[PDB]
Amino acid sequence: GEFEKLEALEQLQSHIEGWEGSNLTDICTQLLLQGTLLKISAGNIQERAFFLFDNLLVYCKRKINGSLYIFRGRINTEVMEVENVEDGTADYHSNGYTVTNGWKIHNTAKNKWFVCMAKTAEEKQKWLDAIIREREQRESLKLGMERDAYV
């Protein structure tokens, strides 16, 4: 049930070194998707492990020692926007490199944009679908609660 998932979250976080901020078991309940993506941010091109939880996106550098990942950043999905990027696009957001299977993420709390690229079109679609699902679940929960408070 819910409790075994929380234990799983604590275990997952134990594989991430240098964690910043609140713990996964305090704000999340599930993992929608994990995978490797190319991240282009502020002139830097870096491969990262991305984790999309309910309410939270985490990205890490890939690394008895249980550490597999090095914490690099997190975004509250409530303040995250996503914008499609069409294949063949090349501008300063991608350092002038041609983007394929890519998209942009806006961290609105830090007013910061960065580009993500997957290796395949199917993997890109999997990410876009998971981002949509995360947002839909979160909005459904929130609207339900507000409906309860309002009526």
mmCIF file of C-alpha atoms in Angstrom:
data_model
loop_
_atom_site.group_PDB
_atom_site.id
_atom_site.type_symbol
_atom_site.label_atom_id
_atom_site.label_comp_id
_atom_site.label_asym_id
_atom_site.label_seq_id
_atom_site.Cartn_x
_atom_site.Cartn_y
_atom_site.Cartn_z
ATOM 1 C CA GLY A 1 0.000 0.000 0.000
ATOM 2 C CA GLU A 2 0.991 3.612 0.612
ATOM 3 C CA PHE A 3 3.448 2.621 3.333
ATOM 4 C CA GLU A 4 5.592 0.287 1.237
ATOM 5 C CA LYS A 5 5.875 3.052 -1.338
ATOM 6 C CA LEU A 6 7.137 5.440 1.352
ATOM 7 C CA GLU A 7 9.784 2.907 2.366
ATOM 8 C CA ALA A 8 10.698 2.577 -1.298
ATOM 9 C CA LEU A 9 11.057 6.390 -1.515
ATOM 10 C CA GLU A 10 13.388 6.487 1.469
ATOM 11 C CA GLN A 11 15.440 3.692 -0.089
ATOM 12 C CA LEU A 12 15.558 5.510 -3.460
ATOM 13 C CA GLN A 13 16.695 8.736 -1.845
ATOM 14 C CA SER A 14 19.440 6.777 -0.051
ATOM 15 C CA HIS A 15 21.072 6.247 -3.498
ATOM 16 C CA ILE A 16 21.351 10.021 -4.030
ATOM 17 C CA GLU A 17 24.375 11.763 -2.481
ATOM 18 C CA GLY A 18 24.284 15.454 -1.515
ATOM 19 C CA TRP A 19 20.482 15.711 -1.230
ATOM 20 C CA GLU A 20 19.184 19.267 -0.690
ATOM 21 C CA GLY A 21 15.827 20.247 0.785
ATOM 22 C CA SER A 22 12.915 18.303 2.218
ATOM 23 C CA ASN A 23 12.923 14.520 2.042
ATOM 24 C CA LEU A 24 10.971 12.546 -0.564
ATOM 25 C CA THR A 25 8.798 10.790 2.041
ATOM 26 C CA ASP A 26 7.554 14.155 3.306
ATOM 27 C CA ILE A 27 6.280 15.495 -0.016
ATOM 28 C CA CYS A 28 5.993 12.602 -2.518
ATOM 29 C CA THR A 29 4.189 9.253 -2.736
ATOM 30 C CA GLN A 30 5.133 7.859 -6.153
ATOM 31 C CA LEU A 31 7.617 7.864 -9.036
ATOM 32 C CA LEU A 32 6.051 8.471 -12.433
ATOM 33 C CA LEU A 33 9.254 8.132 -14.451
ATOM 34 C CA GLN A 34 13.032 8.003 -14.284
ATOM 35 C CA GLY A 35 15.544 8.176 -17.108
ATOM 36 C CA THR A 36 18.702 9.692 -18.519
ATOM 37 C CA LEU A 37 18.432 12.934 -20.509
ATOM 38 C CA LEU A 38 20.832 15.456 -21.994
ATOM 39 C CA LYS A 39 20.399 18.750 -20.119
ATOM 40 C CA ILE A 40 21.522 22.059 -21.626
ATOM 41 C CA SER A 41 21.441 24.913 -19.136
ATOM 42 C CA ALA A 42 23.175 28.311 -19.081
ATOM 43 C CA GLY A 43 25.875 27.289 -21.564
ATOM 44 C CA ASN A 44 26.515 23.861 -20.028
ATOM 45 C CA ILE A 45 25.764 20.542 -21.732
ATOM 46 C CA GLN A 46 25.456 17.730 -19.208
ATOM 47 C CA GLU A 47 23.929 14.246 -19.121
ATOM 48 C CA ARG A 48 21.657 13.813 -16.069
ATOM 49 C CA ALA A 49 19.467 11.204 -14.398
ATOM 50 C CA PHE A 50 15.958 12.691 -14.067
ATOM 51 C CA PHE A 51 13.288 11.553 -11.599
ATOM 52 C CA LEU A 52 9.691 12.738 -11.836
ATOM 53 C CA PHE A 53 7.703 12.263 -8.637
ATOM 54 C CA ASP A 54 4.316 13.575 -7.751
ATOM 55 C CA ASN A 55 5.034 17.236 -6.873
ATOM 56 C CA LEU A 56 8.752 17.107 -7.642
ATOM 57 C CA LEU A 57 11.338 16.820 -10.429
ATOM 58 C CA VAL A 58 14.875 15.866 -9.410
ATOM 59 C CA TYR A 59 17.980 15.718 -11.585
ATOM 60 C CA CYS A 60 21.351 14.174 -10.695
ATOM 61 C CA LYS A 61 24.790 13.390 -12.058
ATOM 62 C CA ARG A 62 25.397 9.663 -12.363
ATOM 63 C CA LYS A 63 28.137 8.539 -9.956
ATOM 64 C CA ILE A 64 28.958 -1.237 0.792
ATOM 65 C CA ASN A 65 28.466 2.200 -0.791
ATOM 66 C CA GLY A 66 24.871 2.673 -1.908
ATOM 67 C CA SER A 67 25.349 5.964 -3.800
ATOM 68 C CA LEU A 68 24.469 5.878 -7.510
ATOM 69 C CA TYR A 69 23.688 9.544 -8.114
ATOM 70 C CA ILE A 70 24.910 12.993 -7.143
ATOM 71 C CA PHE A 71 22.156 15.507 -6.411
ATOM 72 C CA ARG A 72 22.219 18.487 -8.776
ATOM 73 C CA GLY A 73 18.785 20.090 -8.661
ATOM 74 C CA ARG A 74 15.084 19.928 -7.843
ATOM 75 C CA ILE A 75 11.935 21.707 -9.020
ATOM 76 C CA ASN A 76 8.526 21.902 -7.339
ATOM 77 C CA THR A 77 6.280 20.873 -10.216
ATOM 78 C CA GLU A 78 3.729 23.517 -9.139
ATOM 79 C CA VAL A 79 6.229 26.073 -10.474
ATOM 80 C CA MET A 80 7.397 24.150 -13.534
ATOM 81 C CA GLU A 81 6.321 24.845 -17.120
ATOM 82 C CA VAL A 82 7.170 22.718 -20.154
ATOM 83 C CA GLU A 83 7.387 23.811 -23.778
ATOM 84 C CA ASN A 84 7.795 21.516 -26.798
ATOM 85 C CA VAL A 85 10.824 22.005 -29.064
ATOM 86 C CA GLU A 86 10.635 20.950 -32.696
ATOM 87 C CA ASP A 87 13.352 18.794 -34.225
ATOM 88 C CA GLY A 88 15.987 20.820 -36.071
ATOM 89 C CA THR A 89 15.735 23.822 -33.776
ATOM 90 C CA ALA A 90 19.096 25.363 -32.939
ATOM 91 C CA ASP A 91 19.345 28.526 -30.868
ATOM 92 C CA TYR A 92 21.053 29.835 -27.756
ATOM 93 C CA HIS A 93 18.893 27.611 -25.508
ATOM 94 C CA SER A 94 20.735 24.593 -26.880
ATOM 95 C CA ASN A 95 24.094 26.382 -27.163
ATOM 96 C CA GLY A 96 23.515 26.411 -30.927
ATOM 97 C CA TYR A 97 23.439 22.615 -31.128
ATOM 98 C CA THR A 98 20.618 21.039 -33.123
ATOM 99 C CA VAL A 99 17.813 19.761 -30.912
ATOM 100 C CA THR A 100 16.070 16.479 -31.609
ATOM 101 C CA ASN A 101 13.660 14.656 -29.293
ATOM 102 C CA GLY A 102 13.848 17.671 -27.014
ATOM 103 C CA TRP A 103 11.838 20.146 -24.963
ATOM 104 C CA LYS A 104 12.274 23.039 -22.556
ATOM 105 C CA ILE A 105 11.626 23.257 -18.838
ATOM 106 C CA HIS A 106 10.908 26.536 -17.061
ATOM 107 C CA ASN A 107 11.679 26.786 -13.371
ATOM 108 C CA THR A 108 9.471 29.784 -12.672
ATOM 109 C CA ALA A 109 10.627 30.118 -9.052
ATOM 110 C CA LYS A 110 14.176 30.759 -10.284
ATOM 111 C CA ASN A 111 13.132 32.274 -13.641
ATOM 112 C CA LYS A 112 15.341 29.781 -15.414
ATOM 113 C CA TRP A 113 14.919 27.827 -18.669
ATOM 114 C CA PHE A 114 16.803 24.703 -19.752
ATOM 115 C CA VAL A 115 16.608 22.176 -22.582
ATOM 116 C CA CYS A 116 16.147 18.412 -22.188
ATOM 117 C CA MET A 117 16.886 15.917 -24.965
ATOM 118 C CA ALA A 118 16.041 12.234 -25.055
ATOM 119 C CA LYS A 119 17.807 9.732 -27.299
ATOM 120 C CA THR A 120 14.598 8.650 -29.082
ATOM 121 C CA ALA A 121 11.206 10.068 -30.066
ATOM 122 C CA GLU A 122 9.490 7.355 -28.033
ATOM 123 C CA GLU A 123 11.452 8.356 -24.924
ATOM 124 C CA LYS A 124 10.557 12.024 -25.438
ATOM 125 C CA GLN A 125 6.881 11.056 -25.708
ATOM 126 C CA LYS A 126 7.185 9.018 -22.524
ATOM 127 C CA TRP A 127 8.527 12.106 -20.705
ATOM 128 C CA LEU A 128 5.892 14.473 -22.117
ATOM 129 C CA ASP A 129 3.148 11.999 -21.185
ATOM 130 C CA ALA A 130 4.510 11.602 -17.633
ATOM 131 C CA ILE A 131 4.756 15.401 -17.168
ATOM 132 C CA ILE A 132 1.145 15.741 -18.326
ATOM 133 C CA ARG A 133 0.033 12.901 -16.021
ATOM 134 C CA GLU A 134 1.846 14.368 -12.995
ATOM 135 C CA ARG A 135 0.209 17.727 -13.580
ATOM 136 C CA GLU A 136 -3.253 16.191 -14.134
ATOM 137 C CA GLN A 137 -3.083 14.113 -10.943
ATOM 138 C CA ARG A 138 -1.880 17.100 -8.926
ATOM 139 C CA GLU A 139 -4.595 19.420 -10.336
ATOM 140 C CA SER A 140 -7.299 16.814 -9.764
ATOM 141 C CA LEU A 141 -6.286 16.422 -6.135
ATOM 142 C CA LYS A 142 -6.065 20.180 -5.599
ATOM 143 C CA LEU A 143 -9.375 21.005 -7.295
ATOM 144 C CA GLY A 144 -11.051 18.235 -5.344
ATOM 145 C CA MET A 145 -9.807 19.684 -2.051
ATOM 146 C CA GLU A 146 -10.770 23.249 -2.987
ATOM 147 C CA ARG A 147 -14.215 21.975 -4.029
ATOM 148 C CA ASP A 148 -14.533 20.397 -0.583
ATOM 149 C CA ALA A 149 -13.548 23.653 1.144
ATOM 150 C CA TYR A 150 -15.775 25.841 -1.053
ATOM 151 C CA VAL A 151 -18.999 23.817 -1.019
#
